[PDB]
Design an enzyme around this catalytic site. Structure first.
Site, short mmCIF file in Angstrom:
data_model
loop_
_atom_site.label_atom_id
_atom_site.label_comp_id
_atom_site.label_asym_id
_atom_site.label_seq_id
_atom_site.Cartn_x
_atom_site.Cartn_y
_atom_site.Cartn_z
N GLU A 65 4.52 19.64 9.08
CA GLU A 65 5.29 18.46 9.55
C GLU A 65 6.80 18.57 9.33
O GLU A 65 7.55 17.87 10.01
CB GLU A 65 4.83 17.22 8.73
N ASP A 115 8.04 12.42 17.10
CA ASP A 115 7.08 13.47 16.82
C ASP A 115 6.72 14.29 18.06
O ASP A 115 7.36 14.12 19.10
CB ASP A 115 5.79 12.95 16.13
N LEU A 160 4.27 8.61 10.73
CA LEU A 160 4.31 7.89 11.98
C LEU A 160 4.68 6.45 11.74
O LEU A 160 4.05 5.79 10.89
CB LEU A 160 2.94 7.94 12.68
N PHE A 202 -4.61 13.52 8.92
CA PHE A 202 -3.25 13.08 8.75
C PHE A 202 -2.60 13.11 10.11
O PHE A 202 -1.91 12.16 10.44
CB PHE A 202 -2.53 14.11 7.85
N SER A 226 -17.62 20.37 16.94
CA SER A 226 -17.02 21.33 16.03
C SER A 226 -17.43 20.96 14.58
O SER A 226 -17.77 21.84 13.80
CB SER A 226 -15.48 21.35 16.10
N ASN A 245 -15.02 26.20 19.31
CA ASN A 245 -15.16 24.86 19.79
C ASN A 245 -13.90 24.00 19.52
O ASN A 245 -13.42 23.23 20.38
CB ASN A 245 -16.51 24.25 19.29
K LIG Z 1 6.61 16.22 12.31
#
Ligand SMILES: [K+]
Ligand SMILES: [Cl-]
Ligand SMILES: [Cl-]
Length: 164
Positions: free
Chosen positions: A11, A20, A32, A104, A117, A132
């Site tokens: 991030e 983002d 966020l 996250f 998956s 997958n």
């Molecule tokens: K970011």
């Protein structure tokens, strides 16, 4: 390597409001703020999150505080999610980190969308799960990151993060 270091790599860290990969207002370490197009709305979220009138900029300490909260919440949430607990409980610590990373990034809902998956993961069918996972909007939109997570799921090692 651990969840924090891992997510910090994936991030980055930005002290002023930014958008983002999806175009959404965010701050710090991938926190966020809102999916709203409104910068004002995002700044209102920020202030509420931090507890003060900031004008779109935070300190590093502040950033880490939201980050700590976000990882904790991520974990707590998965642990009480029925679609996810069992698969997560079935995993080793390394792969658990990868799972937490995905929540996250995309939220529980998003992650539970990976039913197939997840199931291969629960089965410990590493390569199959890997293949997958890649058949997703997620992988197409964030391929580098997705590939890193997938390698972790595949191998159960931090090699992919090994020099980031
Ligand atoms: K970011
Ligand atoms: Cl918050
Ligand atoms: Cl990416």
């Amino acid at each position: 390597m651990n969840i924090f270091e891992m997510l910090r790599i994936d991030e980055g860290l930005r002290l002023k409001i930014y958008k983002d990969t999806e175009g959404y207002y965010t701050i710090g370490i991938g926190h966020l703020l809102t999916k709203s197009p409104s910068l004002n709305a995002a700044k209102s979220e920020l202030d509420k999150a931090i507890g003060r009138n900031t004008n779109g900029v935070i300190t590093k300490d502040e950033a880490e505080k939201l980050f700590n909260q976000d990882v904790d919440a991520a974990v707590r949430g998965v642990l009480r999610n029925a679609k996810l607990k069992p698969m997560y409980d079935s995993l080793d610590a390394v792969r658990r980190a990868a799972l937490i990373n995905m929540v996250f990034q995309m939220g529980e809902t998003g992650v539970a969308g990976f039913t197939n998956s997840l199931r291969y993961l629960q089965q410990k069918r590493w390569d199959e799960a890997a293949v997958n996972f890649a058949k997703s909007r997620w992988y197409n939109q964030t391929p580098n990151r997705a590939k890193r997570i997938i390698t972790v799921f595949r191998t159960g090692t931090w090699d992919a993060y090994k020099n980031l």
